[PDB]
Amino acid sequence: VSPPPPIADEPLTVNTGIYLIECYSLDDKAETFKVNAFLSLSWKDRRLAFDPVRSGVRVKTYEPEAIWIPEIRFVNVENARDADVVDISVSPDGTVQYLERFSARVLSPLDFRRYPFDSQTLHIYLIVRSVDTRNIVLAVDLEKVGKNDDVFLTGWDIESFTAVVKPANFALEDRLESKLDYQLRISRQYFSYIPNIILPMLFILFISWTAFWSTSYEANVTLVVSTLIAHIAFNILVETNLPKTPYMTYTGAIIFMIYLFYFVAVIEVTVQHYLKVESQPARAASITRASRIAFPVVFLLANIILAFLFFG
Amino acid sequence: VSPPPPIADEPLTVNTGIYLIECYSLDDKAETFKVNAFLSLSWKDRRLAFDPVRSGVRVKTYEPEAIWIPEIRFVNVENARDADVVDISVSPDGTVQYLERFSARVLSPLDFRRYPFDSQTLHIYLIVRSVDTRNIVLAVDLEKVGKNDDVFLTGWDIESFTAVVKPANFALEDRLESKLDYQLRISRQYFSYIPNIILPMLFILFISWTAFWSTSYEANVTLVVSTLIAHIAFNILVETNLPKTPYMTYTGAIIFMIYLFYFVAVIEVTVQHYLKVESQPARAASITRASRIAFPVVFLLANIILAFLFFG
Amino acid sequence: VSPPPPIADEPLTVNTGIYLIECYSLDDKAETFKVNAFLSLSWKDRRLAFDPVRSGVRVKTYEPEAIWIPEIRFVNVENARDADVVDISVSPDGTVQYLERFSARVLSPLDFRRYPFDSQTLHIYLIVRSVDTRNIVLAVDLEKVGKNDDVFLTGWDIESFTAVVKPANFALEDRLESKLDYQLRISRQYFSYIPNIILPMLFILFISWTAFWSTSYEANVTLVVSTLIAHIAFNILVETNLPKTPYMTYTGAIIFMIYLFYFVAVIEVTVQHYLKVESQPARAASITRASRIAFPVVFLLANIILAFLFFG
Amino acid sequence: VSPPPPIADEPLTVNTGIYLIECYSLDDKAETFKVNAFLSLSWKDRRLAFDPVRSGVRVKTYEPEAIWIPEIRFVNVENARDADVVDISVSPDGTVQYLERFSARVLSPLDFRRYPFDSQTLHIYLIVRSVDTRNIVLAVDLEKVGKNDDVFLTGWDIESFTAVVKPANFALEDRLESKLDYQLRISRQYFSYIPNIILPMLFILFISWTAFWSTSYEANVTLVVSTLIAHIAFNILVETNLPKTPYMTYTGAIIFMIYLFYFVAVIEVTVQHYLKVESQPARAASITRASRIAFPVVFLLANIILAFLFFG
Amino acid sequence: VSPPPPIADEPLTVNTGIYLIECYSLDDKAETFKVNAFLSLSWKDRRLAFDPVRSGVRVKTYEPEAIWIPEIRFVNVENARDADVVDISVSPDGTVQYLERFSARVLSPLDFRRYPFDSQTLHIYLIVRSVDTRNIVLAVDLEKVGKNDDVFLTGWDIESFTAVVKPANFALEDRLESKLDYQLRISRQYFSYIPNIILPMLFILFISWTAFWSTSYEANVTLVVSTLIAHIAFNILVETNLPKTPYMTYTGAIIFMIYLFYFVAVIEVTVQHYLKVESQPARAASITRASRIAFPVVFLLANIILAFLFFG
């Protein structure tokens, strides 16, 4: 088949719409995610009507090798999509309707700062090949684009799914400047993360801090060092689900602060024991009474400062 | 070949039946599972008989490129199934029998709350393409649908395998409203999970609780903190088989409760030691006698409350 | 080409033989294993001789698209095998010889109870398609079936490789009842498992038991709890190679027994310390003298009972 | 189609240009990396003009099966690239422009010494097949080669992207000596590595060193050995992201030095305790006062020597 | 096309040569390795010259579908190789030159005893299909076979790359007895393994042995048991890179010996404490003085015996 011939130099407008079905496999190390969805195409096909007789008002059904199907390519994909044509129904007026299912892998960038309370935005880009009959300009219709409201992407909630028109902005472009940008906004559910991670760390830190009400040097050493070992083990456990991040993060800053606090506690215990051995009990008592109030207040202030710095 | 022509506007009814062979690879992180099974198709083929002579009562054998094979697509799959035609035998009356083997990947949602005692339900959806001769409506026959009763899906037991008819409920539909829903019910075998997980945790918790019959502060500290380290290590071991779950779970609630109990035990030991140092032995003795009864009763009540909350 | 026409209603007998080459990748979580082997086919081809002249006694060489190659399908495979025809030589008498190499994935069930001393049996099923000329019945010849005696499946030893005839036993069958069952028996080499796993656990348990010859409560607590931590760490190390098993196992029973023994030892130490504090040294001495003989004998008896229960 | 015939024995010069789009999946164990990019081809096509009429100054659009597309193969790839032709536009003058998108896997060597502060250089090699019309020599144009400046390769920064001409230097070559070498320079961002790895190790080492201000043998033993256990656990945590390296590395040297320092500290503590037991307190006091200054200075000098050795 | 006809019953000799390019992905669990290399073919093609005119001394260039390309199959591969023809140049004399690039997966057996100082030998087998014109016998030429001397297989060094002729030795053979065996010898670089594994284990063992110069039972117990825990953790760390080996190994024997030494040290400490409690200090002093010399000498002798046993 051949593309429709021009009529009055009117640009060929193709209305594109993506209907989401399933979103899954949000890989973080590879920064990829697999998507399975539909695709709706509807282009003007005047001067090439298919039996427009009023007595033949029945919807015309055709095959892929019957008329010119426009060629649309995805930019940020690893390979060509698996096209699965479902139905091709065209009204006798001339408007063609096309539906298919595809499952491709999309390359989109992900930022994991503000990890426990982050929001992501996925992008899908579409490019239509040029033709020798008349330039084709992509248009977005708000009726076909949408989602089934049953996306099984666990751990995230979908806020919106829109599409706009943007220039190609490619150094190798010649005439194509009508790419499409589909934006999907998701938000992470952070309810379980608090009891899963934050509270046990605070409990271990408080258990370590309980050494300021004691005097036995051996008991204090055992408490502090064993709590440090427990903290290291819990960090090893936490690192299993956390993705590899080659930049600073809120959780990493918190962990570093906890390490610093453990070091300061060790120093304080050593100083207290040294003073007690050197037989200056008044200074040791004053230091150990001051630390009980000094540590929690400084910890809270540092946490507030870090939260303000990382969340505006 | 071409689809059979209409006769008296009677809708073409296709009887579909899936015969399970092997179910395996129940991936939880991807929320997928691979299935290998048969597929039986039988559609009315009147006015296109194949030598209906009584002397030719022998069963007719044909090839895939001999007659019109109906096109059936799966909705919740990553890609097209691997069709492997086994036999195509049609009686001289006109009824056609079709059998094939396929191995596709199915996308079905899985809930892991009530994890150790959960029950899952897998869904498979079928859609038949429309044709220009007469609308095709899917029908389910109870004879062909079934299982070999030798499914090697370890860790689960199959209760039933039924199929019903449901509307398409798609925003892009035009006339298709005859999707099929195959429901597979499975139940997890929880016998080994008790000795594998629950009992060692209780043993470690009781070992930690054995510190209420002692008076040595160093011994109590060693017991409690080392049992905390052992609990963390056992949690790390348990997390290997548990799937990633971005929501609350019964096991997670139990683990959080155990952490809270460890923290409370540390606080109680510290208070007892502080009282003994401050030379008020009566209060310390009363507290340490009360705790022996207080801890197990509160633990049992909390476990009962959690079980009632998570299991209706 | 076309299948040979019938002569005197004699069923077409096809002699099948599988020659193993390489067996590898015995996946346990997926319960699969990849096999690379040969395949020998020899069927009667009378009335379709290929130059049976005595002066042309030279062996005839043909291509896959020269004569009718029988179609054989594997039942317990994920997808169609990769057929690689090596040679097709047919004698002038009429007997055809066919050889090819394939590498498919086989789905076979594996039982891991009696794990360290278990024996497995792999099954491969073959089905021949029916034809419209004369029913084909599969036959097994003992000359072509065999192995190269150089199977590189490490950790296992091959005992036998036989094949028998069994009914199809399928609910969807029509006339096919001549499936083939190839049985491969393997045995696990358990020599290294003893020094790799069993002996260190016994050493740690004995180190824990060395606390019955001491009196220091702090030393006994340290010994027992630190040995418990070491046991947990060693269990974590062991779990790396052990496959996921959703049912009871000999090793799991042994580990549970070890946990129970640790708990009993903790209870005994606590009771001894409580008696010593309450100033009844005779009873404590009697208990600590009795335990030294009680623990090893009970451990040995329990191990004997478990071995008898799990090994008939 | 056929390649253009020669005119005046002038070698056919093909201008090649690669436009990067996405670089990702820098696998270290396999020493591979996947690249998705464009490819620009422009070759002289005189004597085969495509309607050079001035009134037909419109850009000519063709298909892959319209003219001779030069064949270019990649040397260091696992398999053939996935060619995805985007547009083929040729001016009426005779110059042809070709654009396509490919996603292949490149085999390039990676050196991980100087790991935290290393710089890598990736290579891509191109070879053009010989033809029977006239020898083809590859040329590099500086306009088409480039990058989109939006490479999402996290953890690295791109410095330059150039290309040069080099001899084939193959033992099997006959006449081809015009391979192309595309060099991509990247640098690792080392900011987060310092707080993620280096500082906690120093904190643990200092905590271990705090035992020189004490006299309790049990407390010193507990401190040193528990810090050794914590160091081993932290090394286990660090090894998760570090790639497998079968040669010496800066981090490995640092870890070995830390182990040696722990051993020396254990020896010093044992010697001090032995002297105190043997009742020579002056020597023990002198040794424990000297060690406080000896250890940090030696550690700093050793670190400086290692840094100078590994960084010129 | 058709194979060349026979001339004087002279066997067709094909000179084969493999030129290595990249060797990588030496998987140990699967016992496989991927290889990317060239392949040179040169067979006698007399009586089918391609314009042998002296004025046409120019090298003839052809396509794969121009002449008979001999069929060569690999025996120990999972699937057919990815053939990528580079150039087909034939001199007017009659000798044909063929070059291509392939990337297949090879199944070769690997022995990991003597692991840290082992040497491997990889094998590649080639089989040529028989033809009905004249028997083909494979020959090896020493000029085309070779390597680029730039193999990026890290951790190994290539010593030689030769090829010989061997009989097929297959039970299903008919006339083919001319298989080719390509042997690749590699040696592991063991420099980094010593500081990465061996020395920390010796340091931990010596730290454990430092308990023979002390008398505090609690300190000795803490030292020995905590060093045992550290040894278990280090073994867990080591097991990450070590491949799964279902047979005895030098490293496994060393680890078992270390466990036995830890057990003996625990027994000695317990005996010394029991004697001191029973008030026989002379015997305890004699035992603890003897052990200091007994342990290192026995350890060295056992290591020497193990090395002699495992290395001839």
Author numbering:
A (entry chain C), B (entry chain D), C (entry chain E), D (entry chain B), E (entry chain A): 5 to 316
Publication excerpt:
The GLIC homomer consists of five subunits, each with an ECD and TMD. GLIC is activated by the protonation of a series of titratable residues in the ECD, leading to counterclockwise rotation and contraction of the ECD. Therefore, we established a data processing strategy involving symmetry expansion, backtracking particles, supervised particle reorientation, and 3D reconstruction to resolve high-resolution maps of various asymmetric intermediate states of nanodisc-reconstituted GLIC at pH 4.0, which provide comprehensive understanding of activation mechanism of GLIC.
The i5 and o5 configurations were also reconstructed by applying C1 symmetry, which showed marginally reduced resolution compared to imposed C5 symmetry. Structural comparison showed that GLIC in i5 and o5 conformations resembles the previously resolved preopen C1 and open O states, with RMSDCα of 0.64 Å and 0.18 Å, respectively. Additionally, the positions of annular lipids observed in i5 and o5 states are consistent with those observed in C1 and O states. Notably, among all the structures resolved at pH 4.0, the unexpected presence of the i5 state suggests that activation begins with a symmetric rotation of the ECD from resting state, which is followed by the onset of asymmetric rotation. This finding is consistent with the previous observation where a fast transition to the preopen intermediate state followed by slower and localized transition for channel opening has been proposed.
